[PDB]
Ligand binder design. Structure first.
Ligand SMILES: Nc1ccn([C@@H]2O[C@H](COP(=O)(O)O)[C@@H](O)[C@H]2O)c(=O)n1
Ligand SMILES: Nc1ccn([C@@H]2O[C@H](COP(=O)(O)O)[C@@H](O)[C@H]2O)c(=O)n1
Ligand SMILES: Nc1ccn([C@@H]2O[C@H](COP(=O)(O)O)[C@@H](O)[C@H]2O)c(=O)n1
Ligand SMILES: [Cl-]
Ligand SMILES: [Cl-]
Ligand SMILES: [Cl-]
Ligand SMILES: [Zn+2]
Ligand SMILES: [Zn+2]
Ligand SMILES: [Zn+2]
Lengths: 160, 160, 160
């Protein structure tokens, strides 16, 4: 069994007027937000896919499909907790996590420590090993036109 | 010499009507496929670039250029096998691999284990350390309009 | 404290006619270049964000904001040197770095070793652990239309 396992997640959602903008569990006010079947939490979904992928498990759509055992309107916290449980039972913990959010507007930096603490609380990890940064998309393509929001996560898992 | 080496690959191809859609060696039927000089295998090309990049070698275009030693119409398997040979001679093996495919349509999940087994066979690695997930692009930009397909790979290499 | 720390950076800039194209400190002639408040160095900025992110520090905009202590027209070298200082004081060094540049035109490969040596010089790392590759964007979206340039970096940091 491997002492370290590397994961990558990506997620993108459409932003449309009058919808919720929820990032890592945190509500951020804005003229646009995520139009999705989920709660639209691009950061939470791609952290989940990074964990699942580091471990070689089925992906977020395979584990939590559109069709009930118990999902459909689950808060993204539900998917984060199930992913850390499966990680734990596989014999791994979080070494560190680095997420990049791509978002034209609004500014994420004022909410950053609030996001990091909530994401850390849900992962059961120390905030000193869970990181998030943000970037605009320079007014080009859908992301730049604020017609979408994307997140990348790279994660390094450690054998317990 | 370093016990671990990290790599990242990215590739994107145009999708046009009536072309082959080949992903990780596997044929997937679809109204569009890759218009390319390669066989268009976005997953295979970006795994190759992740390996090459983890090792600090020239990239896929530098190692396998348009101009014969022996390439031009090589199946992407040829590039995967040459990359694992160069990795081996550098003194490394695969720790784990996590690839993300971005594709609006069709659905990749039914073909997933078939893709993973073929990619594992070509890498000479166990399927339990080679992972692939897929994501739509929410109907935005070329990827969302099914006018292209992209792949990211993060890889962690281990010293033998 | 963790023996290894993983980082990811992303950056994108607009390309417009008659501007400088500077990549990893190196001038590359071209009919378009980066229109930015920075020197526009997408590779240098995203290496900085990968380092900062691996360490869990504030991001490039938070550490080097628009408002003087001493920035505003700093060459991107200034940000690279401050990032390696903060890495050093945190007790880390570079294990390896793999950057991917996405650029339709011009061709980066002829300048590649020049870029790698300059980036290595600024990081205080050996060129054998600092890697860069390049990719087109297949004539689609802003990147494909040469209306922008993007860079991804994955980095693995080692405890001293
Ligand atoms: N081309 C694709 C795109 C997505 N998928 C699957 O659909 C799920 C949902 O993807 P989206 O959130 O992008 O809709 C993914 O997590 C994956 O299981 C797929 O199987 N083939
Ligand atoms: N701006 C760019 C884009 C690509 N390239 C080189 O061209 C090769 C082929 O890139 P594409 O498959 O994107 O055409 C790359 O693997 C790289 O060697 C480059 O040298 N400069
Ligand atoms: N949505 C966003 C986008 C960027 N930012 C911040 O602004 C800085 C500059 O981002 P750009 O270079 O993309 O303009 C980032 O490094 C980050 O500190 C943010 O706080 N919220
Ligand atoms: Cl804006
Ligand atoms: Cl669709
Ligand atoms: Cl071109
Ligand atoms: Zn999502
Ligand atoms: Zn390709
Ligand atoms: Zn920048």
């Amino acid at each position: 069994t491997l002492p370290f396992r590397i994961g990558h997640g990506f997620d993108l959602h459409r932003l449309e007027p009058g919808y919720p903008l929820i990032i890592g569990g945190i509500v951020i006010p804005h003229d646009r937000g995520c139009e999705a079947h989920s709660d639209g939490d691009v950061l939470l979904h791609c952290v989940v896919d990074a964990i699942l992928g580091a471990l070689g498990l089925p992906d977020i759509g395979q584990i939590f499909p559109d069709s009930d055992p118990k999902w459909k309107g689950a808060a993204s916290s539900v998917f984060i907790k199930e992913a850390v449980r499966l990680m734990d039972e596989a014999g791994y913990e979080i070494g560190n996590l680095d997420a990049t959010l791509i978002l034209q507007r609004p500014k994420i930096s004022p909410h950053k420590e609030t996001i990091r603490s909530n994401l850390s609380k849900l992962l059961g990890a120390d905030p000193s090993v869970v990181n998030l940064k943000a970037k605009t998309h320079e007014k080009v393509d859908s992301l730049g036109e604020n017609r979408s929001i994307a997140a990348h996560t790279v994660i390094l898992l450690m054998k317990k």
